[PDB]
Design a protein around this nucleic acid. Structure first.
Lengths: 201, 199, 199, 199
DNA sequence: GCCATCAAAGAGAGAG
DNA sequence: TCTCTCTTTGATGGCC
């Protein structure tokens, strides 16, 4: 947000979610994407759902008239997204393409004293369903933590022993040197079910 | 001289479940656990307890058997998941000490026969009949591993390393002491640069 | 009727050296090699060649014995390094076709004897005397694997995977074939994590 | 285009002071400092500041010069201790990738020059006149490092590791790029097993 | 000398 | 089948 260059960017698209409704009442539909300049990696909120094709991964597009909010670039119907020519042939550093796809370790997120927004895959250890807020205890080799789900995201199917592919969840300061992750407006969850839990054909 | 009282311990490490007795098919795995004040070696004879012995899991252990400096866990032994509130803090210095490999000139000089665990460099190896002789060494000196039975069929070579478990130290006259594979013995072989299959 | 004329190849994969004959301490390793046209199964009886057998390496092999679909590489065999001049490119579909496990319903319906490199799941292991029978399974059906000798000593339990090299599929009445361990047979057993060692 | 505004940083590492220009006996040291959100290569030309540069210390810097990716600290530059109040948390990920040595596949193939730090093992060393060249290698490839001037007199043999600070990468036509000695170059030689002194 | 974290590769799950 | 992601393996820096 604050001091946001906002200047036009040249970026290849990395990975993207399918279109979905994050706001049930109005049926507001968005999708998430991560793109990168040769220099730096950005997370992307796309509120014009006609841009999915533009965002097909391995595709280089031009982006301008976008909003900077919460460390994200926000793309609207008025936002310019267009195909960049074959002249560039931009080569994006492997180290970054990996870091944008890396999942933050739990003990890091716990020890974290600052708020932020997280993507990553997480193993669900305990699932505690309470009213409109479902808690998923997630685990790794370095420790375990809590994920609170509310809003539309409560309706999904994730069982203890499944994995959550998290996209845009807030980390908030919580006493005890352990932080809690919260389901927010634009949050999206892809569930990875182990083969025993999934349907069979 | 033992305890046998119920203990809340956290599992450090557990081997795989293996057959130490091929005649009857009898199976076991070895584990290591800790309380605040010390570290225990565990021979677990109920291998359905494998899950429970997942490292970084705290459990209660009761009705086990202390034998030869081991706790032995049988199917009549109580092993159960501990109260989630615990959050025990286990001293680090003691983990190393439980995880430390004895020096050879220190072992070969042993007065009283013990059961050893440790990892070592294998220099010479000699096969005679139903026995296999490993000449092992480090900066302090050198000694021998004497393997027999099921283990003789294992693949380990010069420059390979033996990760050894419950091997009986049998002191000999004139610092000739040697390690021998006993009934509950287990080995992981950690190979050198390329000892193994690739791709 | 085997050509035996010198081939220049690239190394795809190779097993570690192992003792396939305990009595003599006879050792060998396996390797899959490739030209641009065809994939070859190598047996290597000189294990000091293991360095020339690094995967990705281009090499020439001459004066090797062709027996049973395999190229047998002995101490007198010619194995040397291939320079940058070659720069040979091997077809993806073929390099891939070499690493594919034949489906189980295929091997049964096969009325011909042959040799197989495959990975499978262990359905039911019934240990009987000095023999071990692993039922295996995939999407397309089920069958048996029959082990004997040194390979019975292996630790593979129901729920593990079997990496097999040089196993003989034999014609068997009932439109299902079996894989009988042979002398040069090799197995890498792949354990699920919950059964695997931990720390 | 570097900040030039005051920096609150913590000292990570530094070198000893050395004479980089023996004619006037000009002296300097290298240091690496880091803030919350990034790392900087520093050049310190008032050697009396070595005290201030203790690792694990927090200092403020301003009125420095940013040249060639380095912060240049002169006698006129402001260097002073940091308030006991600061308490800054520096990410391990940012430090670890400052202290990461480049792979040689990355360096030889660059079109443009920069100033490099790293640890490399020496393979071949051959000497001519005022010039000395070191072929270094890692898993990704191999290349040369050309040292003329004061750094020729260092003791480095084949097999030693070279720790370089501020050597210039000079790309050449067809992946021929190399690391050259400049006026601010520094080296520590990390000697290997049987090379160095004893008792 | 052991363990922390971390980058590159065989192999599994999805799709066209 | 072939592509993509991934669980898995080998390195490398830090503490006793």
């Amino acid at each position: 947000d604050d001091s946001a260059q906002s200047d036009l960017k040249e970026v290849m698209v990395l990975n993207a979610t399918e279109s979905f409704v994050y706001e049930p009442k109005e049926q507001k539909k968005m999708f998430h994407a991560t793109v990168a300049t040769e220099n730096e990696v950005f997370r992307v909120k796309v509120f014009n759902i006609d841009l999915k094709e533009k965002f097909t991964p391995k595709k280089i597009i031009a982006i301008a008239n976008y909003v900077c909010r919460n460390g994200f670039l926000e793309v609207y119907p008025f936002t310019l997204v267009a195909d960049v020519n074959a002249d560039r042939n931009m080569e994006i550093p492997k180290g970054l393409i990996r870091s944008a796809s890396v999942t933050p370790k739990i003990n890091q997120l716990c020890s974290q004293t600052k708020g932020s927004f997280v993507n990553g895959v997480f193993e669900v250890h305990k699932k505690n369903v309470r009213g409109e807020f479902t808690y998923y205890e997630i685990q790794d080799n370095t420790g375990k933590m809590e994920v609170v789900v509310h809003g539309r995201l409560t309706t999904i199917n994730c069982e203890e022993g499944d994995k959550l592919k998290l996209t845009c969840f807030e980390l908030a300061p919580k006493s005890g040197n352990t932080g809690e992750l919260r389901s927010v407006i634009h949050s999206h969850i892809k569930v990875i079910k182990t083969r025993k839990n999934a349907a069979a054909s």
